[PDB]
Design an enzyme around this catalytic site. Structure first.
Site, mmCIF file in Angstrom:
data_model
loop_
_atom_site.group_PDB
_atom_site.id
_atom_site.type_symbol
_atom_site.label_atom_id
_atom_site.label_comp_id
_atom_site.label_asym_id
_atom_site.label_seq_id
_atom_site.Cartn_x
_atom_site.Cartn_y
_atom_site.Cartn_z
ATOM 1 N N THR I 1 -34.144 -32.689 -53.679
ATOM 2 C CA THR I 1 -33.852 -31.265 -53.285
ATOM 3 C C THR I 1 -34.928 -30.177 -53.070
ATOM 4 O O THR I 1 -35.796 -29.959 -53.903
ATOM 5 C CB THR I 1 -32.866 -30.745 -54.318
ATOM 6 O OG1 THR I 1 -31.804 -31.690 -54.388
ATOM 7 C CG2 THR I 1 -32.238 -29.419 -53.910
HETATM 8 C C1 LIG Z 1 -33.237 -33.685 -54.377
HETATM 9 C C2 LIG Z 1 -32.677 -34.713 -53.326
HETATM 10 C C3 LIG Z 1 -34.019 -34.575 -55.356
HETATM 11 O O1 LIG Z 1 -34.246 -33.819 -56.553
HETATM 12 C C4 LIG Z 1 -32.056 -32.895 -55.142
HETATM 13 O O2 LIG Z 1 -32.470 -32.547 -56.478
HETATM 14 C C5 LIG Z 1 -30.682 -33.601 -55.231
HETATM 15 C C6 LIG Z 1 -29.669 -32.549 -55.679
HETATM 16 C C7 LIG Z 1 -28.350 -32.793 -55.224
HETATM 17 C C8 LIG Z 1 -27.916 -33.947 -54.550
HETATM 18 C C9 LIG Z 1 -26.586 -34.082 -54.153
HETATM 19 C C10 LIG Z 1 -25.662 -33.075 -54.419
HETATM 20 C C11 LIG Z 1 -26.081 -31.929 -55.085
HETATM 21 C C12 LIG Z 1 -27.409 -31.794 -55.485
HETATM 22 N N1 LIG Z 1 -30.675 -34.682 -56.231
HETATM 23 C C13 LIG Z 1 -30.399 -35.962 -55.922
HETATM 24 O O3 LIG Z 1 -30.178 -36.384 -54.788
HETATM 25 C C14 LIG Z 1 -30.385 -36.917 -57.111
HETATM 26 C C15 LIG Z 1 -31.801 -37.335 -57.438
HETATM 27 C C16 LIG Z 1 -31.886 -37.411 -58.837
HETATM 28 C C17 LIG Z 1 -31.351 -38.524 -59.485
HETATM 29 C C18 LIG Z 1 -31.427 -38.635 -60.866
HETATM 30 C C19 LIG Z 1 -32.033 -37.633 -61.628
HETATM 31 O O4 LIG Z 1 -32.118 -37.740 -62.993
HETATM 32 C C20 LIG Z 1 -30.887 -38.020 -63.683
HETATM 33 C C21 LIG Z 1 -32.578 -36.520 -60.982
HETATM 34 C C22 LIG Z 1 -32.504 -36.406 -59.590
HETATM 35 N N2 LIG Z 1 -29.613 -38.122 -56.740
HETATM 36 C C23 LIG Z 1 -28.558 -38.560 -57.453
HETATM 37 O O5 LIG Z 1 -28.122 -38.009 -58.464
HETATM 38 C C24 LIG Z 1 -27.905 -39.848 -56.925
HETATM 39 C C25 LIG Z 1 -26.544 -39.521 -56.291
HETATM 40 N N3 LIG Z 1 -27.711 -40.791 -58.042
HETATM 41 C C26 LIG Z 1 -28.666 -41.659 -58.434
HETATM 42 O O6 LIG Z 1 -29.782 -41.743 -57.920
HETATM 43 C C27 LIG Z 1 -28.288 -42.563 -59.623
HETATM 44 N N4 LIG Z 1 -29.169 -42.136 -60.708
HETATM 45 C C28 LIG Z 1 -28.338 -41.652 -61.833
HETATM 46 C C29 LIG Z 1 -29.181 -41.093 -62.924
HETATM 47 O O7 LIG Z 1 -30.098 -42.155 -63.318
HETATM 48 C C30 LIG Z 1 -30.927 -42.660 -62.231
HETATM 49 C C31 LIG Z 1 -30.058 -43.237 -61.152
#
Ligand SMILES: *[C@@](C)(CO)[C@](*)(O)[C@H](Cc1ccccc1)NC(=O)[C@H](Cc1ccc(OC)cc1)NC(=O)[C@H](C)NC(=O)CN1CCOCC1
Ligand SMILES: *[C@@](C)(CO)[C@](*)(O)[C@H](Cc1ccccc1)NC(=O)[C@H](Cc1ccc(OC)cc1)NC(=O)[C@H](C)NC(=O)CN1CCOCC1
Ligand SMILES: *[C@@](C)(CO)[C@](*)(O)[C@H](Cc1ccccc1)NC(=O)[C@H](Cc1ccc(OC)cc1)NC(=O)[C@H](C)NC(=O)CN1CCOCC1
Ligand SMILES: *[C@@](C)(CO)[C@](*)(O)[C@H](Cc1ccccc1)NC(=O)[C@H](Cc1ccc(OC)cc1)NC(=O)[C@H](C)NC(=O)CN1CCOCC1
Ligand SMILES: [Mg+2]
Ligand SMILES: [Mg+2]
Ligand SMILES: [Mg+2]
EC number: 3.4.25.1
Lengths: 228, 212, 196, 222, 195, 222, 204, 195, 196
Positions: I1
């Site tokens: 993000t």
């Molecule tokens: C940008 C892309 C990266 O920080 C944004 O923060 C974004 C915010 C967002 C995305 C969709 C809807 C609303 C807001 N975050 C992500 O895309 C996020 C990246 C992320 C994953 C894990 C984190 O620590 C727990 C921090 C940031 N992506 C996800 O949550 C995706 C959907 N899920 C995974 O990657 C599965 N994760 C779960 C937690 O453990 C690691 C694997």
């Protein structure tokens, strides 16, 4: 078990003949990122106490709320809330010290280092420290973080023992504090130029100074320095 | 620690050292490792010091409550089993206790029970417990007979602790002697190793490894 | 560190802060991170102070020996010697170096060398911990064929922001101007750049 | 990971006489290589002619003293203002410490006073409650430096009568309050020389039948 | 490997060494001789890591025998023990050290005195009236402190040794299948067949 | 350790405390941390004590041989170059943190070297456990165009800050002044503000107190 | 598995009026097991005395090594080595093994034959020289020895008085350490006579 | 603890159990009886973690004795074994499981048949003609595969058992200080005093 | 993000990219990171998608229940509820949330809530992985009391740079305008913002 995220650096303080002085910069660091610049880390409680807090800012804001709530609770069913039964520095400290040690004993600490500066009802200067471990101590000069390493040596040249307190004026004491804040700006990588300073005197009361800046800095010799 | 107690013709001998340690730091030379539970019951202490001291004095309170409730002195078996069942509840938590419940009752006669912090409970005639138990076993076993006199048995117990006190770095200070008969326990004094070693060496002609 | 090098109409300018840290303690607040490897070939040093120093000294030795035999080396040649050391010793080094020099044929040139030891020739380069905070600013504000005064302002404003946000950067802003005219050292103090 | 313990340094010392007892302790408080306070007392009058110190981790030490002081208070309430004897105070403290056997108070505790025959008494504890009455005990960071000196000068260990061929030991005798304070002062100045966590000041609390007196002496501040 | 003892008396040195060779949950052999004759009046018993023990013992044996042939002369027990110590002292700071503990029992023909040396794998040498390696010492040292006298005969020494073996057989956890006993005196080295 | 270096009008001055530690124990109360590399090039050392001694001697030796080879007085930059290249080669495993100073035909100089082989230049520097206490003083009181007597005062004040406030530093203040055109004056124990007070008692034992088993004359002659 | 505290032991040295004293315990153990009560830790090369604490294999090795070196010194120099010079030799030799050191705590003691001055010195395992006017301590009960020496010591003690002070320092320090004791030896050293006394101490 | 054996023959079940109780480098006792009588015609031997063994055995013993009093009736060996298994099957998924292995030898009076059950600490039950726990099985099973016959007498069973103990004494690393043998048949439980 | 919220003369505007990543794979290139907790109180979500979603849903529930009893909540109140959840569950959450809302008394307000759970009221706020690259740019270009068109340009240019440098950011630039007039949704596609 915690890890501190948004953090505040040194809080420094000392006693003088009629009262106490305390100071702390206005920075909220996010690791190496100097994220927030409008953070007030000195919080007055009544007109006779100032609590200076370093460490985790989320935990600092929690402690703010606790002190805010303590003033409210003390006022309940208390006709002498602004007189004989007002909150003393020693009461406020012991409360925090109790909380800090209880939280460390539950393995879920408030990740802070705290200095409570004030003046008691009988005119006596109050200055005492407490941290995340519940460790407490008092001294003519007290400082947290880098302040402990750099400020204390400078402040102890002014007030080295108890007998030096009556001999120290507010002008001399404040000058030493402001000097220490400059030294910390030179040398602490998580410090800022902007800071706040508070004086609690037994005669003139609480004087809270905001938006101060470090000044009269020596940088000119730098031009003469070449390579390694 | 080194503690022993053995059964013989004339009752039970119990002998202990008096050293306390905190690593290689000698914490004390004058510690009491025998607890007098009642005129007919003794308890020896080896292992963690607070653990022994706290739970064996606690054991004494449970033994006192037994004779108040039952109008009769507790059996050595029942006393030992109170302690063994207690430490078993704490098994895994990290208690460190090597104990010997020694005493006389009418129904049992002279009896010794070994109880330790893993929950092991054993009746037996001879036991040595502690860091220097092996050194004590060496002297005690090689000189033990059932038909020892009260005088000879007292000495063998004393000499066996001295042997361990000498060799074991984590044992020493002084020897505390006890003798348990049908009439109860009898204290046979505190014997400082500082004087006892040289007295034994000279009179017995032993300890030839040492520079005389 | 915050460091950068920028090419412009008359040549190239190197820029750097003056902060050296051992943890959160500032070991030196007046450091000189701009170092001479040849008359008109300089470099900005970021990463390990010891590693970058040892490298720069070896490069200065190589180019001095080059000059004794084959005359003035190109800026590309200097960058190649830096690369060779950084690449071949990548496992034992933490050094991010920007090489900048002035030829008369090639004018101003900037080569950046990240951790891996790869070489990248660019119009301008930024590096060090504090550079992360000014990618946006520098991209929007950089223009090719700037004047000396414009380039000095571009570097001053850029490093001012890098210093403001990075705790590992601060002190004075040193600069070194490389043109046909010669070599000029510039310094800028907090009281000036902080209130930009 | 969060570490709930810390080391506040310093050192303490208890000696018992015939009709008195002293409990001494330096006033320096430290963390790592920094001095927190040059005067932070850790020897406390707890009432009923009992003085107490819990040296090591100050947060645990203060907590324990606080709890014992409170234990004395409730002893009076529950048992008709009866004086808490030093032997009874010792056993109570064992239960306070052992109560936290699996998350200990990181302190070496010493109490001093008079026994029920009016004679001087010093009790000492490990961190989890084991205790023992002695004539002599040093505790804390410099305990390893001071304790052997006390064995030699208070209990006359390794000292024999001259000309008796190492056969007759130096006889045990009580020391005067003047002689005991000399040993305390020399013990602390010696410990201050060779231990970095010891210095600044020395505060002695003397206990006689008349009450609890204090004496303070400067120590080297480096 | 495991149990090796040594007792120096008036006129001889007696070495006792266990016969068991165990590996995993199987006693592979119950008649093993854990010793090598270094010279006519010098015997070395050994215990430690599998393979290392015999390899080291034979290596020392070869060196001492080489010296004997070269000089047509027997090295003193003191000299042999110092040589052995130095080899172990080198070993401990090698890439892969010898994990072997030894007892060296010898009769010095020039002094007409028996000598017993105890050397561990670090190269820690001590002359003793009685010695042991491994867990054995935790029983035998205290026992010998009591029963040993310096002016004892060889027969008295063997009875003293029987007292040790009996104690070990009573209190040791492992079955070590008895011991091979050997005597070193003015007339050389001989084995006691019925123990 | 606490060590400093300060530049002045016609030269440079360095100073150091005299405490050596092993853990919390003071091993040496009056050790010498100021090291002679050449007659007019001196070095203040912090860190692993043997490393600072060995590395300063080795470079000092090679500097003397170099000075004889070139028929020239040695330069500070030569010592700096040799020290940093040596330390770098050992990737920090030689734990020497040095303040190198001196005068030579080029002028007066002041440098610092870290264990990993990085060098700094400055008018005032401080290294060691008490470098923060010292630097605080230096930052507060240093100015351009210091005199000799002012620089000695500033340097010794910066060491005192370490002595009193840092537990890793103590005892005395050593100073070495290196002025241009003059011999370098090494001021051993320039200040001694930590003298041990008179002991309360003499512990001289009566002759015969110690029990003896054997006596014998030892032969030291051939 | 901490090399400096497997075998155990202690050494202490002191200066007096025109004399020096050096003393050591006799224990050699393997952790808890006491093995030998005859293991002396003080050696001498001419009139220079050396005490060594720590890992026993290195104690023996270094003695043999310094005997080796001082013997060659004497053959080439045609004189006995002096304490100040020997101190430097010890430091060089230890630092030669900088990254694979001997786990020892040596202590030099002796009187300079030319000047008549009493001299003592101590080292860490890696060669750092610790010179002292008053006393040097070493071993597993070094903390204990520091506390005893710092209180009991006074300057300019006569040889007979100095013997009592050093002996009491060692004995009472040893009795508070599990890995030290089991007997003790004291050397009193005058300009041209040396007395060696074995002390009676508690054997536990 | 360590060695516990069991052999079912024509008319009885024979249990053999080692007498040694060892802890560290010391054999604390050499006459230990590692068994409890659950009912007049049911015997349980046990081995495993110190403390757990006796605590578990006595707990089972108490429960079976309670059942006997309540119903004025003896549970069958099969019923007792199923009860024991379930207790161990619960145990294994507890906070701190009983680390105890057991053999249950019984005579079923209704069927007039001997029965031997082997149950490990996981709660793994099997009926067998012969059984063992721990390292013992690595020697005894193959031995019994060869020498065992289903129609053997009690005397033949004891000789077969002597053959096992001899093999264990020869090849096991540890001294287990012999065994206590007990016989379970139509007339109840009795101990062989001379083995 | 990459996310941000900016106060201006008529109120406040929220802005965000549309990229969701699972490692280097883009799980959703058209994500809506701007979420409604109340009529004119919205938030930008950064960090764990699951955590921020679960929080936002609880806050939306709390404010709906608040509205049923005490009428429209303040923007400060909304931020306090976010804080309470984030602070008390700091050990189990990875959520960096920006809260933005429009009152008629207080006009536009922005509260940022980092990982710890602290609250910070600011004129404008930036957050998410891509925000690091635009601290310099945003500080130099932000002014108080901007117009709607100026603020839209400020956000568009800012997020364009954040997207350009951050691999974890991309797709379309969504925006939400909060004023007295009402609520307006804006979208901006790559073909427009990339070539700014
Ligand atoms: C940008 C892309 C990266 O920080 C944004 O923060 C974004 C915010 C967002 C995305 C969709 C809807 C609303 C807001 N975050 C992500 O895309 C996020 C990246 C992320 C994953 C894990 C984190 O620590 C727990 C921090 C940031 N992506 C996800 O949550 C995706 C959907 N899920 C995974 O990657 C599965 N994760 C779960 C937690 O453990 C690691 C694997
Ligand atoms: C000999 C000396 C070997 O230790 C004995 O076992 C002796 C027995 C004894 C009995 C009663 C009174 C005093 C001494 N044991 C000790 O002296 C004992 C050794 C020991 C230390 C720690 C252990 O871990 C549990 C086990 C044994 N020493 C102590 O208990 C010392 C005085 N106290 C501590 O070490 C305090 N520790 C205890 C464990 O919890 C943390 C604090
Ligand atoms: C900024 C301050 C931080 O990145 C710059 O990169 C700066 C560059 C610089 C400084 C002085 C002279 C020229 C160039 N780097 C440092 O100040 C650097 C920070 C750093 C340390 C270690 C690194 O990995 C090996 C990377 C960056 N500081 C130092 O090198 C200081 C002098 N030394 C130490 O902190 C000691 N280090 C040695 C390596 O191991 C960790 C401890
Ligand atoms: C102050 C006192 C640090 O506390 C100084 O740095 C001082 C410098 C110094 C220089 C010359 C002469 C005397 C003193 N350093 C020490 O006193 C030093 C402290 C230290 C110990 C260990 C370290 O890293 C492992 C670093 C610094 N003390 C020593 O070097 C002592 C004499 N030796 C040891 O503690 C044993 N060393 C052997 C080498 O390996 C590390 C431990
Ligand atoms: Mg002992
Ligand atoms: Mg200091
Ligand atoms: Mg992208």
């Amino acid at each position: 078990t915690q890890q501190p995220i948004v953090t505040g650096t040194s809080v420094i303080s000392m006693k003088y003949d009629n009262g106490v002085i305390i100071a702390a910069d206005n920075l909220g660091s996010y690791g190496s990122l100097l994220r927030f610049n409008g953070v007030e880390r000195l919080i007055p409680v009544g007109d006779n106490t100032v609590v200076g807090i370093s460490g985790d800012i989320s935990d600092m804001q929690h402690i703010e709320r606790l002190l805010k709530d303590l003033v409210t609770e003390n006022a309940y069913d208390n006709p002498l809330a602004d007189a004989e039964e007002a909150l003393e520095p020693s009461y406020i400290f012991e409360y925090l010290a109790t909380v800090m040690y209880q939280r460390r004993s539950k393995m879920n600490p408030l990740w802070n280092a705290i200095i409570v500066a004030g003046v008691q009802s009988n005119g006596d200067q109050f200055l005492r420290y407490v941290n995340l471990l519940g460790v407490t101590y008092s001294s003519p000069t007290l400082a947290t973080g880098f302040g402990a390493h750099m400020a204390n040596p400078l402040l102890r040249k002014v007030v080295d023992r108890e007998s030096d307190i009556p001999k120290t004026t507010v002008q001399v004491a404040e000058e030493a504090i402001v000097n220490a804040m400059r030294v910390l700006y030179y040398r602490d990588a998580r410090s800022s130029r902007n800071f706040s300073l508070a004086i609690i005197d037994k005669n003139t009361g609480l004087t809270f100074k905001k938006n101060l800046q470090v000044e009269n800095m020596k940088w000119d010799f730098a031009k003469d320095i070449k390579g390694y | 620690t080194t503690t022993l107690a053995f059964r013989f013709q004339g009752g039970i001998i119990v002998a202990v050292d008096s050293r306390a340690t905190a690593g290689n730091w000698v914490a004390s030379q004058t510690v009491k490792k025998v607890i007098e539970i009642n005129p007919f019951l003794l308890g020896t202490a080896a292992g963690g010091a607070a653990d022994c001291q706290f739970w064996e004095t606690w054991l004494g309170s449970q033994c006192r409550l037994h004779e108040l409730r039952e109008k009769e002195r507790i059996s050595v078996a029942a006393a030992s089993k109170i302690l063994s069942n207690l430490v078993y509840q704490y098994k895994g938590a990290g208690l460190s206790m090597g104990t010997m419940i020694c005493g006389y009752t009418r129904k049992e006669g002279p009896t010794i029970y070994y109880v330790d912090s893993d929950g092991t409970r054993l009746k037996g005639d001879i036991f040595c417990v502690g860091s220097g138990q092996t050194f004590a076993y060496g002297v005690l076993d090689s000189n033990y007979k059932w038909d020892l006199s009260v005088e000879d048995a007292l000495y063998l117990g004393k000499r066996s602790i001295l042997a361990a006190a000498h060799r074991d770095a984590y044992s020493g200070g002084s020897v505390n002697l006890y003798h348990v008969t049908e009439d109860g326990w009898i204290y046979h004094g505190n014997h400082d190793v500082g004087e006892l070693f040289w007295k034994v060496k000279e009179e017995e002609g032993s300890f030839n490894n040492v520079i005389g | 560190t915050s460091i950068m090098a920028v090419t412009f109409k008359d040549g190239v300018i190197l820029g750097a802060d003056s902060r050296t840290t051992t943890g959160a303690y500032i070991a030196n607040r007046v450091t000189d991170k701009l170092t001479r490897v040849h008359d008109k070939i300089w470099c900005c040093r970021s990463g390990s102070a010891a590693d970058t120093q040892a490298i720069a000294d070896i490069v200065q030795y190589h180019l001095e020996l080059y000059t004794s035999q084959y005359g003035t080396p190109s800026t590309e040649t200097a960058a190649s010697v830096f690369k060779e050391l950084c690449y071949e010793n990548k496992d034992n080094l933490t050094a991010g170096i920007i090489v900048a020099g002035y030829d008369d044929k090639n004018k101003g040139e900037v080569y950046t060398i990240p951790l891996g030891g790869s070489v990248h020739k660019l119009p301008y380069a930024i590096a060090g911990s504090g550079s992360t905070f000014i990618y946006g600013y520098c991209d929007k504000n950089f223009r090719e064929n700037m004047s000396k005064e414009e380039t000095v302002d571009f570097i001053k404003h850029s490093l001012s922001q890098a210093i403001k946000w990075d705790g590992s950067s601060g002190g004075v802003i040193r600069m070194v101007v490389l043109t046909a005219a010669g070599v000029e050292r510039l310094i800028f103090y907090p009281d000036e750049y902080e209130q930009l | 990971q969060f570490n709930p313990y810390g080391d506040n340094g310093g050192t303490i010392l208890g000696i018992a006489g015939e009709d008195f007892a002293v409990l001494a302790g330096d006033t320096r408080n430290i963390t790592d290589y920094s001095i927190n306070s040059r005067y932070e007392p850790k020897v406390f009058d707890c009432g009923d002619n009992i003085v107490m110190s819990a040296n090591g981790f100050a947060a645990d030490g203060d907590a324990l003293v606080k709890r014992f002081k409170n234990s004395v208070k409730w002893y009076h309430f529950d048992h008709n203002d009866k004086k808490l004897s030093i032997n009874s105070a010792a056993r109570n403290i064992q239960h306070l410490l052992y109560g936290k056997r699996f998350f200990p108070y990181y302190v070496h505790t010493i109490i001093a006073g008079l026994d029920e025959d009016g004679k001087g008494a010093v009790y000492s504890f490990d961190p989890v409650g084991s205790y023992e009455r002695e004539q002599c005990r040093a505790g804390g960071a410099a305990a390893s430096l001071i304790m052997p000196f006390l064995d030699n000068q208070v209990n006359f260990k390794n000292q024999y009568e001259p000309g008796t061929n190492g056969k007759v030991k130096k006889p045990l005798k009580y020391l005067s309050v003047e002689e005991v304070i000399k040993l305390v002062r020399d013990s602390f100045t010696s410990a201050t020389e060779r231990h970095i966590q010891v210095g600044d000041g020395l505060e002695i609390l003397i206990v006689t039948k008349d009450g609890v007196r204090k004496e303070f002496y400067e120590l080297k501040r480096d | 490997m495991d149990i090796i003892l040594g007792i120096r008396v008036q006129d001889s040195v007696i070495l006792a060494s266990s016969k068991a060779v165990t590996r995993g949950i199987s006693v592979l052999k119950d008649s093993d001789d854990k010793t090598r004759q270094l010279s006519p009046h010098t015997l070395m018993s050994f215990a430690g890591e599998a393979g290392d023990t015999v390899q080291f013992a034979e290596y020392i044996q070869a060196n001492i025998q080489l010296y004997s042939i070269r000089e047509d002369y027997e090295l003193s027990p003191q000299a042999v023990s110092s040589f052995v110590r130095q080899e172990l002292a080198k070993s401990i700071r090698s890439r892969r050290p010898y994990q072997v503990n030894v007892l060296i029992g010898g009769y010095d023909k020039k002094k007409n005195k028996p000598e017993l040396y105890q050397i561990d794998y670090l190269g820690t040498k001590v002359e003793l009236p009685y010695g042991a390696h491994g867990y054995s010492g935790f029983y035998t040292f205290s026992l010998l402190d009591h029963h040993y006298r310096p002016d004892m005969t060889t027969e008295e020494g063997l009875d003293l040794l029987k007292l040790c073996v009996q104690e070990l057989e009573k209190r040791m956890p492992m079955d070590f299948k008895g011991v091979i006993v050997k005597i070193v005196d003015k007339d050389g080295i001989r084995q006691v067949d019925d123990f | 350790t606490t060590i400093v270096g300060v530049k002045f009008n016609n030269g440079v001055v360095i100073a150091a405390d005299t405490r050596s530690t092993q853990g919390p124990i003071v091993a040496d109360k009056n050790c010498a941390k100021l090291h002679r590399i050449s007659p007019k090039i001196w070095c203040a050392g912090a860190g692993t004590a043997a490393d600072t001694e060995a590395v300063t001697q080795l470079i000092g030796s090679n500097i003397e041989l170099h000075s004889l080879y070139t028929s020239r007085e040695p330069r500070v930059v030569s010592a700096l170059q040799m020290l940093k290249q040596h330390l770098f080669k050992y990737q920090g495993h030689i734990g020497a943190y040095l303040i190198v100073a001196g005068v030579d035909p080029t002028g007066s100089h002041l440098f610092s070297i870290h264990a990993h082989g990085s060098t700094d230049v400055g008018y005032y520097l401080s290294l060691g456990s008490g470098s923060l206490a010292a630097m605080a003083v230096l930052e507060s009181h240093w100015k351009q165009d210091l005199t000799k007597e002012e620089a000695i005062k500033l340097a010794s004040d910066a060491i005192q800050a370490g002595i009193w406030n840092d537990l890793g530093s103590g005892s005395n203040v050593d100073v070495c002044v290196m002025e241009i055109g003059k011999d370098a004056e090494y001021l051993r124990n320039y200040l001694t503000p930590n003298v041990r007070e008179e002991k309360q008692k003499s512990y001289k034992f009566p002759r015969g107190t110690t029990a003896v088993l054997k006596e014998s004359i030892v032969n030291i002659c051939d | 598995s901490d090399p400096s505290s497997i075998n155990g032991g202690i050494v202490v040295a002191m200066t007096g009026k025109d004399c020096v004293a050096i003393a050591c315990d006799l224990r050699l153990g393997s952790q808890s097991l006491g093995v030998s009560n005859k293991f002396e830790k003080i050696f001498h090369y001419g009139h220079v005395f050396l005490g060594i604490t720590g890992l026993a294999t290195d104690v023996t090795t270094l003695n043999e090594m310094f005997r080796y070196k001082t013997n060659l010194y004497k053959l080439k120099e045609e004189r006995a080595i002096e304490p100040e010079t020997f101190t430097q030799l010890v430091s060089s030799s230890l630092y030669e093994r900088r990254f694979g050191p001997y786990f020892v705590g040596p202590v030099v003691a002796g009187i300079n034959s030319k000047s008549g001055k009493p001299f003592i010195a101590g080292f860490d395992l890696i060669g750092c020289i610790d010179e002292a006017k008053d006393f040097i301590v070493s071993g597993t009960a070094s903390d204990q020895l520091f506390g005893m020496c710092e209180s009991l010591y006074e300057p300019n003690l006569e040889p007979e008085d100095l013997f009592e002070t050093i002996s009491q320092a060692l004995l009472n320090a040893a009795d508070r350490d599990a890995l030290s004791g089991w007997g003790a030896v004291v050397y009193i050293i005058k300009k041209d006579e040396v007395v060696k006394r074995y002390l009676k101490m508690r054997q536990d």
